[PDB]
Amino acid sequence: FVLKTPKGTRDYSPRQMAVREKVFDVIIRCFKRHGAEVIDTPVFELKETLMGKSKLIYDLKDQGGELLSLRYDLTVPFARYLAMNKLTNIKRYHIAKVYRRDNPAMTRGRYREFYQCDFDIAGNFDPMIPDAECLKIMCEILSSLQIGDFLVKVNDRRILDGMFAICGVSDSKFRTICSSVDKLDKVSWEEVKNEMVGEKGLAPEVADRIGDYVQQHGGVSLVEQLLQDPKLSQNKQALEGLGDLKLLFEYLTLFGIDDKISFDLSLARGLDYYTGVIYEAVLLVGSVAAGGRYDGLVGMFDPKGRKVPCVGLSIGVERIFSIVEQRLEALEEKIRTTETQVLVASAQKKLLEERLKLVSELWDAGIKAELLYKKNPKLLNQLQYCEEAGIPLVAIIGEQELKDGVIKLRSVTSREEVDVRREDLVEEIKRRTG
Amino acid sequence: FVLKTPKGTRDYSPRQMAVREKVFDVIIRCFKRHGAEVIDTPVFELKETLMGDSKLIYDLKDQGGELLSLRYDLTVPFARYLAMNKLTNIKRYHIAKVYRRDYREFYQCDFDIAGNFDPMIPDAECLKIMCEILSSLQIGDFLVKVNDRRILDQALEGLGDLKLLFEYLTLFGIDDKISFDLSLARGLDYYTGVIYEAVLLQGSVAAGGRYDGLVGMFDPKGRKVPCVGLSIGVERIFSIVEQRLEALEEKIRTTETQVLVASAQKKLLEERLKLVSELWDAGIKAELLYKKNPKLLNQLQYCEEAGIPLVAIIGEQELKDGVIKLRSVTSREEVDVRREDLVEEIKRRT
Fold first, then answer.
1. Residue A105 DSSP one-character state
2. Helix count and strand count (H, E) for chain B
3. Which residues are within 8 A (CB) of A56 and not within 5 positions of it... i.e. 6 or more apart?
4. Helix axis angle, B121-137 relative to B157-172, nearest 10°?
């Protein structure tokens, strides 16, 4: 029996937490800015509230009561939440850990306990207004994370269904083809079309009309050409998604995100799920944030079986975590794990108690202070501490520096001292720091 | 139906989160003031990790794999963490849910100093932090009863350890708001030194103590690590804070929206969408109703039942004069400002 965290899990270190924290803040400063409420749900649900999912699910023992299972997702509790409270409309974010008993990467990428960060807008509203706001939030959050330049790929579920019908894919073969054509952003058409014909058995004449569509991508100028596409122009499903997309584009221009988006017919994911728009944000590579509209899901716990038209986004905080901490190992830099702002020190040999008086004073003034938990600390060791923890200042008490009612404030980085009076010390610290 | 949150566990409504935020904010802002690091552990540990009243533990099935169990504690994982990274010195706070089977799923809020230091300076720190928080929470008044294990047993050093703790308490200004009690003994079998417990003056509000025996556990060399900590019963505190919030007539807001963008006339959705983004690009918590042609009364009612202090109205005659009408939901008085000053005008009133 080794001391270890269970297969697929991980402790968050003080360094990692410090990085994880600055990411969440930016993400939450944005959600709050859009007037979103927040809910929280328990870690486990009734074992069978989660039926109708892949059964890569942590199930608890019996141990007495009923059968239970750790949440593999945030949205099933969400749909349980809206039903247990009889809500037809809400705007929430929810940040918590989900549990999928899958095989942990060693390269890496995948964990069994990982953060999920979702934002949602449930309810019946005018067409694409809540759909357009979700894009604005991503681009706000991503741009504010300072992690490089990004693009948002956009597509509609109906344009997919219509395109595959008018091109001629069988419904039973419909969805391994989506799973295939979705690989276009990591691979090439040649290989897609090739993997394809070997595994599907589509007519090569079905594979290559798909290619004339899915290989295309661009802006609104594309959604207008696709309307002019004669065979698409008489597919009812394709015409809706195209309509809903032209409108969606018009709103983004008003948001000033018009160019940070690309309509990409190759995008085809989460089809158990999305019924309208589908979103995915990529860096400039890798999938960093997703989302879209899913109207037939949240209401699937309602008595009379009422739809709850819902749109929303998820953010790959786990991926963004890794990027930030390497962009802080890029400068090979100490991430500050504390917010300590002053260290009460002394060079003399019996002043321990006089320090304690000063720290509580600093504390009760709302200043983040600290002292070494020893009776006669040497000033050299005291300073290394600050240098290590990135503490900006040191407050040195001396006997003949106590006598005149003052305190020595030595800046750790500039090594410069200046005598400050007890009355002005806290003011000085609150100015030499934010 | 019979849609049910698992027995012993409840959800968190937007209003409940509001209290939770304000409470945790006070807690956290104090923990950082004392320069603490923060760690996190998995929600479960190995079954054997969580061994020595103790079959109160949530366990998982057989997976085909290991035998896991949910954390009944925040301190046993602290122990495992220290033995694993091999640390003899750390100061950390941890806010996380625990999973006792008996609520069943509830929050815990530990702050622990670990290491070899001169007498009862860290032990005094914890008490100062406890008083710092209970005061700032503003939940009435409180007292802290203090004790020592070794006294309850040799019963001469706890007398002297406590003798040495009180002057530090005096230097901090905490001497008064604590008390000595010999009956306070629980909990008492992982503890080795001081044992305290917070009590509100009108419960289990806050407790903890010193325990040098609970990190030498997993350490295979058996080298014990001294550790003093505390835990704040943040669940009871959650209820009291709102109970008092409700007793103050005041609305507990669930959002932080400061301005709603409205219009009384028709065909002005586009012009509204443009404006809110400007408010958003400036970091103002603004909002907009997802209607093509909403009515100005419905939006004003949305505001007063949310706590939004302001409304930004757009009309074609305001639209054209470079002017934007700003009405205050409460006083219902009106100003119109040029588009430029608006982003700053709003920040002024909030």
1. P
2. 10, 15
3. A72, A100, A101, A102
4. 50
Nearest CA to CA, how far is A123 from chain B (Å)? 10
Contact (CB<8Å) B43/A303? no
A244 and A368 share a domain? no
Contact A280, A302 (CB under 8 A): no
Mention every residue, 6+ apart, whose C-beta is less than 8 A from residue A360: B128, B171, B172, B173
CB-nearest partner of B60 from A11, A61, A255: A61
- In Å, how far is B136's CA from the nearest CA of chain A? 11
Report resolution in angstroms. Answer: 2.8
Distance, in Å, from the CA atom of A37 to the CA atom of A34, rounded to the nearest integer, reads: 9
A350 and A367 in one domain? yes
Locus of tokens 């100015």: A431
Number of independent structural domains in chain A: 2
From chain A, the residues in CB contact with B128 under 8 A are 360, 363
Q: Which two tokens stand for residue B71?
A: 């954390």
| 3 state DSSP class of A66 | coil
Chain B residues with CB under 8 Å of A33 CB are 280, 283-286
Query: Which helix (H) or strand (E) is A189 found in, with range?
Result: helix A189-199
Task: Pick out the residues of the known binding site of B for L-histidine.
Answer: 73-75, 100, 108, 112, 186, 190-191
Instruction: Give the one of B35, B218, B292 whose C-beta lies nearest to A368's C-beta.
Output: B35
- Solving technique: X-ray
> How many interchain CB pairs under 8 A, A with B?
209
Same domain, A57 and A92: yes
Q: For testing the chain A interface, which of B171, B291, B299, B350 should be mutated: the one with the most A CBs within 10 Å?
A: B171
Please answer whether residues B25 and B41 qualify as being in contact, where contact means their C-beta atoms are separated by less than 8 angstroms: no
Three-state SS for B215? Answer: coil
The one-letter amino acid at B66: E
Cα gap A312→A310, rounded to integer Å: 7
CA A150/CA A142 separation, integer angstroms = 8
Residues A280 and A189 in one domain: yes
Burial zone of B209 (CB within 10 Å; 0-12 exposed, 13-18 middle, 19+ buried): buried
To the question of whether residue A336 is assigned a binding role by annotation, the answer is no
- Same domain? For A267 and A327 the reply is yes
Cα B89 versus chain centre, distance: 25
Q: Which residue range(s) make up the domain with B132?
A: 1-350
Answer whether A398's CB lies under 8 Å from A347's CB.
yes
State the Cα–Cα distance between residues B42 and A11, nearest whole angstrom. Answer: 6
Domain containing residue A197: CATH number: 3.30.930.10
Query: Are B291 and A80 within 8 A, CB to CB?
Result: no
Classified as helix, coil or strand, B179 is strand
Domain identity same for A168 and A91: yes
- Asked if residue A262 and residue A170 are part of one domain, the reply reads yes
Residue with tokens 């700053």: B344
